[PDB]
């Protein structure tokens, strides 16, 4: 088949590569509206912090190299502006020449992802972070203007990682957020260590705070405060890149995302959608799910490649929503339904706080583990863990448990790998099972 | 019921405590032949290494506190010397007075564990390590004799832990072992970093080596070598503490262990056995299993408590044999059937070696993960992982997979918690799945 892909990053480049593993004859073309393909989205805050200094970690390929290795044609600075599904073409704008053309397809794969929201101010010192273009602009602005004070807006994992990296770079960030609901994939009462880490390092923050007005470097806030900043990075959520799809026959939900089946098919034959733009369902409960993260983009890319060029019995079984962020010394992880989705179930909660490992052995830190379960069938609905140590481990175990439909009571049977540096004879996971009695 | 427990440590003290949680009325007495109850077996190498200097860490209870807190009677220096199972009494020797007496029971719980084997040389410089008495004696001997050169005999995990601790204390150990199968719960090829770490620190070792004779401090070896050592710590295996059981009606296997059912019942009514003394079967395959580790002692303890005083439908489901040890910078973990047991199956092996986390993220290291599966049904039989980082996480996840008899192919579906410090969008575990075809 002739394969056209929209978006040349987490879902798109991966999918195209996986197809090429299976099918060496098909023509494959990817359109990407911006400058770079295959950049490491997750690495970007660390590039800003000068933790990653080697370009080759920020950018896996150029189009020239992708072609040389994989015989996949990637056209950057080409923006798909309409999908002519009845004719099986897409309309493409070459941004360099400002001419548009039609490209035909046999199979079309949509992985356009999302764009960062902006607060809308007219300001030369304000930036968003979504791609490597962004990252380079930020790094350049910092050097050209000898930036010291940075205002970081928003309190999701992107802003938090940006904040940490700005600090390690030697700058002086302040964090504001419009409410007190920070890091909202995590249970609201388990986020205190974020504030403790800011406090310990004397990093100012203000919650229930917003930008009210901007005058050059003079920033006036909703609280009435007036301060001077060298730069602003806004991390105020994202929106799906789906405007270009609206005229087509592809079905979009009211929020601009694309519902798909377990084969990542849209309602239109021969058109797939994957990554942040796609919505699906949870694996462990009968509810809709959107999990705009890297695992989902890569897994869908693999499934779509099998659908097109491999074993088409391979289908998605739904999301669990496993997610994690590091902030200074702490790890915050969760899996399962979102806090706001718990109310659709009759549920109970169990929790334990305990050293990640042997108290005696060096370097312990309390790890808080919380598990919500369905009273009707004792199935695990959500888990969350926060601690300096051991959190990623317990959440991955619980992810695997939820995959196999484990009950909370069966957590007593989990056979942990025990020695003093790693856990306990009855692990936190085991204690959750015992306490659920 | 009147409950008599034999052994006051991992299985015994725990089981007594768990019964008391459910049952406030029953009289519970524990007999322990040595000085201390509830010592932290696992902590003992770290006590020798002075990584633990506060003994409260190595002793978790005294009989006086167990009685005040739990109303359970513990009699130390009381050795059970016979089981008179037909009259439901045990004969007990008070070691301080050297007088014996009978203690009656409605239920008897045997958790006597195992003792260290000895090479049997007449020598005042040789020590074994199994309890806190042993630990004190070793520590005392090091000080009294200003021990520098120490010979560590045996290359099992405990012995490796002792070696590491002697080294960090400032002593100069040499390791020997009678064969080349060091750390035998791990695949032999995957144990090489143990020898690498020894080599890096110029800690001598000799495999396929044994003591031939001891003359004071002069040690003569099988190789013909003759060396001077200030001290010798022998870790040459253990043997079950079942001599006191032989005259009873309880069935022992040819090695002196006690076969039990999934309720931890022996063949004799009202008598249970748990901990290192007991043998069972694997959870995921139909084979006998003996897993003399802490998790199993604690789990059986809880199950016996439920049998006696709680929910008697709660039964054991078998072992997976999850185990782990730290040796200097590396972690060595495995789960499932032992290497020698693989030959009972038609199997295949899949492996990956990849960074524990994002390649661009500092302090990364290669993690080697290996999975063996049954060709007849794709089910996972064994897994092993070795590396400076991330091994415990993957093996714990795989333990949870095997608990559910997951197939190697379903590993593609594992939803990992991804951010750069922790894993990859396609984790090592997923890669095992993708590589299994
Ligand atoms: C944060 C956000 C996530 N963002 C992204 O992932 C965007 C950037 N990524 C890409 O564009 C894309 O993933 C690239 C980098 C192009 C990789 O494509 P692919 O996954 O198909 O891998 P590749 O072709 O590079 O493969 C080589 C190694 O992969 C093994 N492989 C792949 N697929 C299979 C299957 N199906 N079966 C068996 N083996 C497979 C190949 O054997 C091969 O190996 P080799 O043995 O010679 O090495 C996070 S992030 O920072 O962007 C991030 C992204 C990616 C990884 C880490 C972190
Ligand atoms: C080395 C190898 C194995 N060795 C040992 O375990 C050494 C000896 N151990 C014991 O003697 C026994 O395990 C002691 C240490 C006495 C503890 O008994 P138990 O497990 O019953 O726990 P405890 O009564 O002390 O309870 C404390 C926390 O756990 C909660 N709990 C316990 N059980 C339940 C159940 N069933 N349901 C709900 N909650 C339970 C308690 O409430 C209590 O909670 P809190 O006040 O803290 O909330 C291994 S090691 O190095 O010796 C080692 C041993 C133990 C831990 C780590 C390492
Ligand atoms: C700063 C940052 C940090 C992150 N950290 C993590 C993390 O730690 N863990 C995690 O799991 N996820 C993380 N993510 C999220 C992860 O990067 C996304 O979930 C993943 O990139 C989604 O892949 P995608 O292909 O759907 O979108 P993207 O990777 O963003 O790719 C979409 C591409 O499509 C292009 N495009 C859009 N419309 C068109 C069109 N009309 N024509 C041509 N091209 C178009 C865009 O320019 C873009 O390049 C992070 C994201 C960011 C921005
Ligand atoms: C140095 C060391 C390090 C270890 N590290 C680990 C580790 O990292 N991870 C892990 O999982 N496991 C580890 N273990 C093993 C763990 O300690 C054992 O699996 C666990 O203790 C088994 O519990 P048990 O009750 O069967 O035996 P024990 O805990 O050893 O208790 C048996 C008790 O019974 C007493 N006894 C025996 N016979 C009689 C009798 N006739 N009358 C009265 N009392 C009697 C003994 O004196 C002893 O106190 C380690 C063990 C040692 C020795
Ligand atoms: Cl341009
Ligand atoms: Cl053209
Ligand atoms: Cl600094
Ligand atoms: Cl009874
Ligand atoms: Cl005595
Ligand atoms: Cl008496
Ligand atoms: Cl390394
Ligand atoms: Mg730079
Ligand atoms: Mg000391
Ligand atoms: Mg008799």
Short mmCIF file of N, CA and C in Angstrom, two decimals, chain A residues 325-372:
data_model
loop_
_atom_site.label_atom_id
_atom_site.label_comp_id
_atom_site.label_asym_id
_atom_site.label_seq_id
_atom_site.Cartn_x
_atom_site.Cartn_y
_atom_site.Cartn_z
N UNK A 325 6.35 11.03 37.30
CA UNK A 325 7.21 12.19 37.14
C UNK A 325 8.19 12.28 38.31
N UNK A 326 9.39 12.74 37.99
CA UNK A 326 10.39 13.05 38.99
C UNK A 326 10.37 14.55 39.25
N UNK A 327 10.46 14.92 40.52
CA UNK A 327 10.64 16.32 40.87
C UNK A 327 11.65 16.38 41.99
N UNK A 328 12.84 16.87 41.67
CA UNK A 328 13.94 16.88 42.61
C UNK A 328 14.12 15.48 43.22
N UNK A 329 14.03 15.32 44.54
CA UNK A 329 14.31 14.00 45.12
C UNK A 329 13.15 13.00 45.07
N UNK A 330 11.96 13.44 44.66
CA UNK A 330 10.79 12.58 44.75
C UNK A 330 10.29 12.05 43.42
N UNK A 331 9.57 10.93 43.51
CA UNK A 331 8.97 10.30 42.37
C UNK A 331 7.48 10.26 42.65
N UNK A 332 6.67 10.62 41.66
CA UNK A 332 5.22 10.61 41.82
C UNK A 332 4.63 9.73 40.75
N UNK A 333 4.00 8.63 41.15
CA UNK A 333 3.47 7.71 40.15
C UNK A 333 2.05 7.24 40.43
N UNK A 334 1.31 7.03 39.34
CA UNK A 334 -0.06 6.55 39.46
C UNK A 334 -0.48 5.71 38.26
N UNK A 335 -1.49 4.89 38.48
CA UNK A 335 -1.98 4.01 37.44
C UNK A 335 -3.47 3.73 37.69
N UNK A 336 -4.24 3.65 36.61
CA UNK A 336 -5.66 3.37 36.73
C UNK A 336 -6.53 4.58 36.44
N UNK A 337 -7.79 4.52 36.85
CA UNK A 337 -8.69 5.65 36.62
C UNK A 337 -8.17 6.89 37.32
N UNK A 338 -8.55 8.03 36.77
CA UNK A 338 -8.15 9.33 37.29
C UNK A 338 -8.93 9.58 38.56
N UNK A 339 -8.42 10.50 39.41
CA UNK A 339 -9.13 10.76 40.66
C UNK A 339 -10.58 11.12 40.39
N UNK A 340 -10.82 11.93 39.37
CA UNK A 340 -12.18 12.38 39.13
C UNK A 340 -13.11 11.28 38.59
N UNK A 341 -12.55 10.12 38.25
CA UNK A 341 -13.32 9.01 37.68
C UNK A 341 -13.73 7.99 38.74
N UNK A 342 -13.09 8.07 39.90
CA UNK A 342 -13.41 7.18 41.01
C UNK A 342 -14.90 7.21 41.37
N UNK A 343 -15.53 8.38 41.23
CA UNK A 343 -16.93 8.50 41.65
C UNK A 343 -17.90 7.67 40.82
N UNK A 344 -17.46 7.12 39.70
CA UNK A 344 -18.36 6.27 38.94
C UNK A 344 -18.40 4.86 39.49
N UNK A 345 -17.64 4.63 40.57
CA UNK A 345 -17.61 3.32 41.23
C UNK A 345 -17.93 3.46 42.71
N UNK A 346 -18.50 2.41 43.29
CA UNK A 346 -18.51 2.30 44.74
C UNK A 346 -17.13 1.77 45.12
N UNK A 347 -16.33 2.57 45.81
CA UNK A 347 -14.96 2.16 46.04
C UNK A 347 -14.53 2.29 47.49
N UNK A 348 -13.41 1.65 47.82
CA UNK A 348 -12.76 1.87 49.10
C UNK A 348 -11.28 2.09 48.87
N UNK A 349 -10.63 2.67 49.86
CA UNK A 349 -9.23 3.00 49.71
C UNK A 349 -8.44 2.38 50.86
N UNK A 350 -7.23 1.91 50.54
CA UNK A 350 -6.31 1.38 51.54
C UNK A 350 -4.96 2.02 51.28
N UNK A 351 -4.19 2.29 52.32
CA UNK A 351 -2.89 2.89 52.09
C UNK A 351 -1.87 2.47 53.13
N UNK A 352 -0.61 2.54 52.74
CA UNK A 352 0.50 2.24 53.62
C UNK A 352 1.64 3.19 53.37
N UNK A 353 2.30 3.56 54.45
CA UNK A 353 3.51 4.32 54.34
C UNK A 353 4.59 3.57 55.08
N UNK A 354 5.70 3.35 54.40
CA UNK A 354 6.70 2.50 54.98
C UNK A 354 7.99 2.77 54.24
N UNK A 355 9.12 2.42 54.86
CA UNK A 355 10.39 2.56 54.18
C UNK A 355 10.32 1.76 52.90
N UNK A 356 10.94 2.30 51.85
CA UNK A 356 11.05 1.62 50.58
C UNK A 356 11.80 0.31 50.77
N UNK A 357 12.71 0.30 51.74
CA UNK A 357 13.51 -0.89 52.02
C UNK A 357 13.80 -0.98 53.50
N UNK A 358 14.85 -1.72 53.84
CA UNK A 358 15.25 -1.90 55.23
C UNK A 358 15.61 -0.58 55.90
N UNK A 359 14.97 -0.30 57.03
CA UNK A 359 15.22 0.88 57.83
C UNK A 359 16.69 0.97 58.19
N UNK A 360 17.25 -0.19 58.54
CA UNK A 360 18.65 -0.28 58.95
C UNK A 360 19.58 0.04 57.82
N UNK A 361 19.22 -0.46 56.66
CA UNK A 361 20.10 -0.28 55.55
C UNK A 361 19.96 1.21 55.32
N UNK A 362 21.08 1.86 55.01
CA UNK A 362 21.25 3.22 54.53
C UNK A 362 20.09 3.71 53.70
N UNK A 363 19.90 5.02 53.74
CA UNK A 363 19.26 5.71 52.65
C UNK A 363 17.77 5.47 52.50
N UNK A 364 17.13 5.06 53.58
CA UNK A 364 15.70 4.83 53.51
C UNK A 364 14.95 6.14 53.40
N UNK A 365 13.72 6.02 52.96
CA UNK A 365 12.86 7.16 52.78
C UNK A 365 11.50 6.53 52.78
N UNK A 366 10.54 7.19 53.41
CA UNK A 366 9.22 6.59 53.47
C UNK A 366 8.57 6.66 52.11
N UNK A 367 7.88 5.59 51.79
CA UNK A 367 7.18 5.47 50.53
C UNK A 367 5.72 5.34 50.87
N UNK A 368 4.90 6.19 50.26
CA UNK A 368 3.47 6.13 50.50
C UNK A 368 2.79 5.46 49.33
N UNK A 369 2.07 4.38 49.61
CA UNK A 369 1.36 3.63 48.58
C UNK A 369 -0.13 3.58 48.89
N UNK A 370 -0.93 3.96 47.90
CA UNK A 370 -2.38 4.02 48.07
C UNK A 370 -3.06 3.25 46.95
N UNK A 371 -4.09 2.47 47.30
CA UNK A 371 -4.78 1.63 46.33
C UNK A 371 -6.28 1.76 46.53
N UNK A 372 -7.00 2.05 45.45
CA UNK A 372 -8.46 2.11 45.48
C UNK A 372 -9.02 0.87 44.80
#
